[PDB]
Amino acid sequence: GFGNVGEDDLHPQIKKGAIFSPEEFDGIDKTDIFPLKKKRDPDSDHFKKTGGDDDNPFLY
Amino acid sequence: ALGIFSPDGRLIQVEYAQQASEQGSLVVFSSDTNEICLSIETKTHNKMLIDQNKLLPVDKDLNIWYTFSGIKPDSYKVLNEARLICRNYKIKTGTNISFDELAYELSLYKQKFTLDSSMRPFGIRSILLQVKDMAKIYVLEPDGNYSEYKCGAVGQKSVSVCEYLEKCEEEDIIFRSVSGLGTVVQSDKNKVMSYVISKDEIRRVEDETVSQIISTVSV
Amino acid sequence: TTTLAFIFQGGMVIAVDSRASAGSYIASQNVHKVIRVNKHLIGTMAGGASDCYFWEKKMGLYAKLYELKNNKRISVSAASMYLSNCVYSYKGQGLSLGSMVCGYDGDKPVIYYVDDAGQRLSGDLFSVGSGSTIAYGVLNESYRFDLTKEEALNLGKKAIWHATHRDAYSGGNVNLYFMDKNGWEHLGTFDVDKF
Amino acid sequence: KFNPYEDNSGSTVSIRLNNSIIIAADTRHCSEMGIYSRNTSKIFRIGDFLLTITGFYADGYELYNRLKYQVQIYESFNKISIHSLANLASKIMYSKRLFPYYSYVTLSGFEGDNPYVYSFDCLGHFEEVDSVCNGSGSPLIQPLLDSTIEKKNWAGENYEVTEEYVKDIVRRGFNAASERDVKTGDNVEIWIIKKDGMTKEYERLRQD
Amino acid sequence: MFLDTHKQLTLFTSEGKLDQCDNALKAATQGSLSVGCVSENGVVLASLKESNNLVILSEYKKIYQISPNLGITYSGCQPDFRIQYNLSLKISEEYTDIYSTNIPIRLFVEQFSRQIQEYTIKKGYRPFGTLLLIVGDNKMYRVDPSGSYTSLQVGTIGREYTESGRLLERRKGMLDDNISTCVECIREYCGRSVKSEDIDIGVYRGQEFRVYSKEEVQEVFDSIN
Amino acid sequence: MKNFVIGSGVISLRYKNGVITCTDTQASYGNLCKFNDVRRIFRLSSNTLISLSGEISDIQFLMNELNKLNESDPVKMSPRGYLNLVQGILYNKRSRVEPLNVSVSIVGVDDDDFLVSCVNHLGNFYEDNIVCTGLSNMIALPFLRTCNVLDLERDEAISLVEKAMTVMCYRSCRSSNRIQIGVVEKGLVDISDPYVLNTDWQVGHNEEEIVL
Amino acid sequence: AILDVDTVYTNTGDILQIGYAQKAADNGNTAICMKNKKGLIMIAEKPIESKLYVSEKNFRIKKVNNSIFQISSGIETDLVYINENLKNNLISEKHSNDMDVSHESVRNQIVNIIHQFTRYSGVRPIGINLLTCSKYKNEYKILQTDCTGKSLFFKSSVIGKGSRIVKTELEKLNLENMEIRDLVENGIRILYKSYDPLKDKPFDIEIGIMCEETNGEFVRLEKNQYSEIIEKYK
Amino acid sequence: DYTNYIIFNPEGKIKQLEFINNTVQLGSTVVALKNKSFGVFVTYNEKRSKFALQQKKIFPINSKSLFSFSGITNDGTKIVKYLKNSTVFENIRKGRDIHPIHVFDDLCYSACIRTLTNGNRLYGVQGLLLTDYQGISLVLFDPKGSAKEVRGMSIGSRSQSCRTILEDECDKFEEYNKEELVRLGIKALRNAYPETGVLNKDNVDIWILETNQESKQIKSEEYLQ
Amino acid sequence: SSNTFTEEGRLLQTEYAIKNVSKGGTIIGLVCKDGVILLGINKTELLDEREKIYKINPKVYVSVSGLFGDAMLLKKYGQVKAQDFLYEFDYDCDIDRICNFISEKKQLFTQYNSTRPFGFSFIYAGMKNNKFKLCSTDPSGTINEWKGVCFGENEDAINNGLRNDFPDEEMDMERGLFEIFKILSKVTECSAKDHKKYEILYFKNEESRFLEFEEIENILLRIEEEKN
Amino acid sequence: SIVSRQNANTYSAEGRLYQVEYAMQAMNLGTSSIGIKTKDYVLLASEKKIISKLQNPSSVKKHYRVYDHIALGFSGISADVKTIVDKSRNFAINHEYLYDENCKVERLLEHLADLSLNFDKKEADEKIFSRPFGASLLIIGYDTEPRLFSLDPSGSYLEYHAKAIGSGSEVIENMLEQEFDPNVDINSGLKNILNMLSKVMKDKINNFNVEITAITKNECKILTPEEIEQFLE
Helix, strand or coil, X not given: CCCCCCHHHHCCCCCCCCCCCCCCCCCCCXXXXXXXXXXXXXXXXXXXXXXXXXXXXXXX | CCCCCCCCCCCHHHHHHHXXXXXXXXXXXXXECCEEEEEEEEECCCCCEECCCXXXXXXXXXXXXXXXXXXXXXXXXXXXXXXXXXXXXXXHHCCCCCHHHHHHHHHHHHHHCCCCCCECCCCEEEEEEEECCCEEEEEECCCCCEEECCEEEECCCHHHHHHHHHHCCCCCHHHHHHHHHHCCCCCCCEEEEEEEEXXXXXXXXXXXXXXXXXXXXXX | CEEEEEEECCEEEEEECCCECXXXXXXXXXXXXXXXXXXXXXXXXXXXXXXXXXXXXXXXXXXXXXXXXXXCCCCHHHHHHHHHHHHHCCCCCCCCEEEEEEEEECCEEEEEEEECCCCEEEECEEEEECCXXXXXXXXXXXXXXXXXXXXXXXXXXXXXXXXXXHCCCCCCEEEEEEEECCEEEEXXXXXXXXX | CCCCCCCCCCCEEEEECCCEXXXXXXXXXXXXXXXXXXXXXXXXXXXXXXXXXXXXXXXXXXXXXXXXXXXXXXXXXXXXXXXXXXXXXXXXXXXXCCCCCCECCEEEEEECCEEEEEEECCCCCEEEECEEEECCCHHHHHHHHHHHCCCCCCCCCCCCCCHHHHHHHHHHHHHHHHHHCCCCCCEEEEEEEECCCEEEEEEECCCC | CCCXXXXXXXXXXXXXXXXHHHHHHHHHHCCCCEEEEECCCXXXXXXXXXXXXXXXXXXXCCEEEEECCEEEEEEECHHHHHHHHHHHHHHHHHHHHHHCCCCCHHHHHHHHHHHHHHHHHCCCCCCCCEEEEEEECCEEEEECCCCCEEEEXXXXXXXXXXXXXXXXXXXXXXXXXHHHHHHHHHHCCCCCCCCHHHEEEEEEECCEEEECCHHHHHHXXXXXX | CCCCCEECCEEEEEECCEEEEEEECCEEECCEEEECCCCCEEEEECCEEEEEEXXXXXXXHHHHHHXXXXXXXXXXXXXXXXXXXXXXXXXXXXXXXXCCCXXXXXXXXXXXXXXXXXXXXXXXXXXXXXXXXXXXXXXXXXXXXXXXXXXXXXXXXXXXXXXXXXXXXXXXXXXXXXXXXXXXXXXXXXXXCCEECCCCCCHHHCCCCCCC | CCCCCCCCECCCCCEHHHHHHHHHHCCCCCEEEEEECCEEEEEEEEECCCCCECHHHCCCCEECCXXXXXXXXXXXXXXXXXXXXXXXXXXXXXXXHCCCCCHHHHHHHHHHHHHHHHHCCCECCCCEEEEEEEEECCEXXXXXXXXXXXXXXXXXXXXCCCHHHHHHHHHCCCCCCCCHHHXXXXXXXXXXXXXXXXXXXXXXXXXXEEEHHHCCCCEECCHHHHHHHHHHHC | CCXXXXXXXCCCCCHHHHHHHHHCCCCCCEEEEECCCEEEEEEECCCCCCCECCXXXXXXXXXXXXXXXXXXXXXXXXXXXXXXXXXXXXXXXXXXXXCCCHHHHHHHHHHHHHHHECCCCCCCEEEEEEEECCCEEEEEEECCCEEEEECEEEECCCHHHHHHHHHCCHHHCCCCCHHHHHHHHHHHHHXXXXXXXXXXXXXXXXXXXXXXXXXXXXXXHHHXX | CCCCCCCCCCCHHHHHHHHHHCCCCCEEEEECCCCEEEEEECCCCCCCCCCCEEEEECCEEEEEEECHHHHHHHHHHHHHHHHHHHHHHCCCCCHHHHHHHHHHHHHHHHHECCCCCCCEEEXXXXXXXXXXXXXXXXXXXXXXXXXXEEECCCHHHHHHHHHHCCCCCCCCXXXXXXXXXXXXXXXXXXXXXXXXXXXXXXXXXXXXXXXXXXXXXXXXXXXXXXXX | CHHHHHXXXXXXXXXXXXXXXXXXXXXXXXXXXXXXXXXXXXXXXEECCCCCCCCCHHHHCCCEEEECCEEEEEEECCHHHHHHHHHHHHHHHHHHHHHCCCCCHHHHHHHHHHHHCCCCCCCHHHCCCCCCCCEEEEEEEECCCEEEEEECCCCCEEEECEEXXXXXXXXXXXXXXXXXXXXXXXXXXXXXXXHHHHCCCCCCCCCCCEEEEEEECCCEEECCHHHHHHHHC
């Protein structure tokens, strides 16, 4: 809840600094393929399996 | 009417509680820098009745003692709250409660029952007593007032005892307390006890001396 | 951060680093990590800047309330116990805190290391913060109870300087205090680059 | 899973001089991957004091409303000092430590003759600063102020600091941020708080 | 002044008596007569039902069952008895939940009497105006508005209680004949000729209490006549 | 945060002496177009319109609260009054970590002052001459901004919004061609009956496919 | 001793405090409500206690919702509480069902909110007569409520001190196929017929109509609409 | 019997609601005049003793809004705080200014609650709210829970003479200018206070409010000396 | 009235509650060398169940006089509190703790304005510091320790007899009960005339027992013969 | 209870609440005290209520330190004054907590006045008692100016240049209107206030039956008996 703000500034670590930092709320030049968050390629368009039984797979 | 003013500006129930606290067995005390002498008188009409000890300890390591005059059952609750205040203060703060803080909190407890409806004032004059660094005696009114007393008396006909103590400025506080008690009580009707509170220690005085000194007053 | 407090024959020394970090970015370089609550009681704040400052200022208000209705200075034990209780009420909620509530109870110096876990220790030498381990090393081989005041101050000043020398989250000015029976005194705001 | 916060660009800079306070902020309101608006003001005023926010714009607006409500309650007797207002802001912010305002508030104003600028974090800690930048562009602008205004690492004789020089430095820093900061805005507000009054200017920034 | 909801309606008089408790006892004493007779083989419990107001006597009941082994009947105002009956059912069901057995007579009477007495100290509340006869476990208990209970061999509540109680002493016997004996006893205290519709009878035999059906009460009266 | 039945997009822009708001009437449950007559443009007053998008249940709840507030107090409200009220409601819901999965656009005119505002599920809000909600914000808004709407008359503004909604239908899964247009001017508030846009789809015809 | 210390029964079964409340209510300013297939109107006396009051902006008619409005006589401040609670209950009821509150539901709310004042001890009877006009399923009904909470639907009703004279005139009146302006005319005429100048101060008229010409919305007529009628009957 | 608490007397009136009318007459006079374009507050303040500072009976709720009251000053301060809070809420959460009459809706509901039930204390304060809302509007709030718009009013001790002086000229307020309204207010005070010397440059504070303009206190030198 | 003071400075309601006790059945107590006698006088033959003397815990017994409903309420309360003490500290409490529980509740009820005092008195038989003890609690809540005491009908007469007719000689509880019967008969013949209403407990801290009316009649013949 | 609350809140036919009228009689049934304000200093002198000489003079103090620069004197029922003092201290510390400054004395007076007539409110911190406090208070402090405030049980308060409370209030006021001049030095002011006090004291004025508090821009001084000795002559 309190966010452990300052743990790194409080302990020797044998990044929680004393002041809360922005966006607390990789080494590759990636950029994005679409403005949509995770989308990269067309959606998998097929009728998707639902129902049946997953916790009793072998009781056909 | 309860917890409210009267037409003449009087807290009627509070003064009735004061009077009820006056109709109690007389207690007399006197103190010097290093000691207090506390004397209590009790009715001996019943031989089968075993007299209770009226000097009860509030906290034994702080050497705080408690005495009262008035409605006895209320004294039980007030003493319980004194002990609870000491213990809770040590739990919360980690250090012993000072005598003045204990007096203030006990006076607040006393006042609590006079600020509200549906509840009745304690109606007991309660005495807090301590000898750790110096003699100190607090007399707490049923309405929450409290102030230190060098010497005094409380209970049945205690005003005359205080008036006598005003003049009886004798160095020996045992003399002062026992003689002040003797101004009212009757040796045949009243059994008397006397205690000397010293540095973290307590003891009661011999019956012979107290009776002898009491006999010389109100002859 | 690296804070330091210890007791020696002549009194008590307190020293802090005054850097404030927000990750890799150094948000501030001159933050004050000592909360003065009265002339005979101060507290070195380590950990979250807001929560540590907030509860210390909430403790400084309790000390003033105690003084008003007792006409008497609050003891260090009561001041630190009040602080530890407040953070202990939030134990396990991620509250990050660590501070030495130090002062004089009459003629006796006492330092209470209070911690977010509700811990409360009285001792003669404490160091808190990321650079505490470096400070502990410099103090271990040099700290003595028989230090003179100048030796003790330089030891505290130098111990913090070494920690800032070697710790990323420690730097800025070495704030230095000397707490005594007659109250504390802010002995300087020395900049580590000018030693 | 619910994310209660949004980042709405940063780049607010406040510098206190000897006799004036220069506080500037970009006017862009940013979504993820997009620009909600190019004319949203990050700077609010409370009497003779200027408040500026960065981060979640709704949180800053709510905090400003809380401050204004508490200040107008307090003002039943006297005007609130900048120090009292900063302390009240810190208390208000910390009251939400379990659900913090995502706002880097910077409160600046004059206490009589003396300028004061207070910088806050999301959890309420406040300190009196000489120049502070909040938000996304803070790492791109703060070193510029440390070097040119505060003269850190300036071993030789220092160029005298003045209002016209500091405003030039501020516009230079905002140009640099808007160049290398994706979310720094299209126009920059520049307020100049002086002893007896305050005034606002505008400049256009990179708009792509 | 308007009604003080916080007022204590039950207080000691200057003579040491509780003013309102005695009035509640008077209210209970005015109720319809009901009797109980203990025997070496069991306990009988009988009460009279008023036929006025076109009450369906076949459906209206005066003797009630709390548990398989306990029965109860009252003299006084009906609403207070209905509330006390809800309370007693709660008590017995709670005991059965905990221990799984039928509540013993004495434990039930104690737990019930304490909650009855609650209202002699409850602010703004008056005591129940009902006397209760509780029959079970080969014993009888009379419970009064004060919350005071007494085990009895022969007991009466309602009108003509003292003289009926004296008559019950003259009308004891074996349980099988005790039913008719006590029906004769209470036939002396009814304003009109008693039909089987006008009387309820509950008898504790062995290990359970059961209330006679209207047809059984006819059989008891056929023995009477 | 409810994500069951979602309305797709809201487009509202201000033009010469007026304001537009437009939404499709489709409501989707996942990939299923469950309803095609769910109407999300409402009249808040004689000079205000509110269009909503997001979870339909949250839309209905929010409009129910707004209607209660409208019938309760005896004092009229300007469009900015409704903007403040809705922003407060949504921000309170967000701060109680029980947010409404709804984003709305309040548009209205008061004494020749024109309001075009947006409020998202978090209580964040802004005002601009063109505000779009949802995937409209990325698809239709860049296209709408290319036209200086401030100098358009009502017919040109309506045509531009219809073109934007046609682009949304082409390039959005959850957007249909059956739109509803709400217009507010100084002395007019109008919400048209939903009508169907006319599409082309002629680009993929190719040369040698028998058009059927 | 009379047991009027509180809302309790006397030995004859009468609740005296409710009688006193009815005495207070019966001395208020008169309001007349007349209902017809074509619409509903209510007239309200507004005595000129002093010329300093802006009578044209002080309203006796209080709206419960868009379809229910009411007026009271007696201690008219009690209508503040009654109206606030009725509004809170009925707005929520209407919008939680997305349909108008029916006349019977309004009557239920009125009776249940007014009864608790005649039912508890530390409480004071409402002390007002209350007229509640409502529209539901394209029908209009007037609900006249007494201090006891007893509320009945009427074709036309009056409250206030001049009720005794107004009621007979209403009984002489036929409402079927009367235009709304005919209702206004008759209401003003009957109100002035009960003026009794020597005992009551001069008054202004507040008229609120609810008819088809306004699709059933409550409309407070401005003085210029009936100044001619007031001049005719002054 | 009927004097002490909230109940109808046999004649059908509540005596406490009449006593609050005497209560609201305790404070010093406030005289208020309104014109469509501007409004005036005139007050008489007397130092309670030679060494007491003036109590500043007039309180500005917001720029272009003034409030003043007579009676128990604690209730008046409560109402001042209530109006300030309502101004803040209405400006922020509703994007508008306080409505002169409807801003008092919650306060009127609370006052009605107090007049309907015992235990709660009746408000002993009568207030005047002069605010610019589509023009200058003046509102009189009464402790019974009703706020009514007025052309001009006088509250406080001896306010009936001021009220009649104002009422003799009410129809001409829409034609008077600001100096004329101030003169009429001072005339009303003079009629209430014909004793010379009592009204002076120090005892009278005049507040001016003009539509679309801030409220200002103006010197009383030009009107009394 | 209620629980409030008066010009005289006394709680009249508590005084009336105390007066109520004297109308109850007589109960007596006496501390002896080897135990405590607890005696009670019922109004009817009651071998079915004990009604005047009860048990709180293995080493505390109480006699009852006054309002039976309140008496049983606070008896159950005291038993529950004794069991709570055993739950807390894993051993049974002494007489003082039960006295404290009941006195605290009684004082609460004589201090609360909207309630009435409990109209009954208890006599507690128990041990403390390895010596027998005999306490008492009035409706006011005061705790009185006694060598011997009486409550109920003939309370004043029996108390006076104990004051000035009971020998000061320490005696085992057999002679203690003999002397109790002596003074009781001297006060009133009805005590020596009938014995089937008596409940008498020979409290020994570990082995307390009740006396059969055959034992009571064995005491009766001794008292009848000693005077002849 | 509803009946007791109604008894508290009943108005008199003349106006003022009955309980307020009774509290205003109770408020002056105590020892006298004088407060003097001058543009340099504010004084507050009170005679101690020494019921008996066995009661030591030190422990019957009548001035309470409300905050760093606020002192509170009182007359009337002294029991209520410790509750008032505790709540005043809480208010002052809360004000510093919110705003990091010493509150204006007027702000404390406003808070206490608001809390006064809140008998009915169910939360302790939002009221003083269930009745008016039977004490009259003279609250002095420094808030960029020496301030003297009097708070009555009615909840009303006024800023004063000089006031006297207690049984000698009227006499001391009739003497103040002749003797008081604010253009006087602090030491001569102390002499004048002690002279005025001695007129009403039951016994002879000395440095042990008198308590004096003087608050100035420099210090919130409480005078020791060895210092009152300087001004008694």
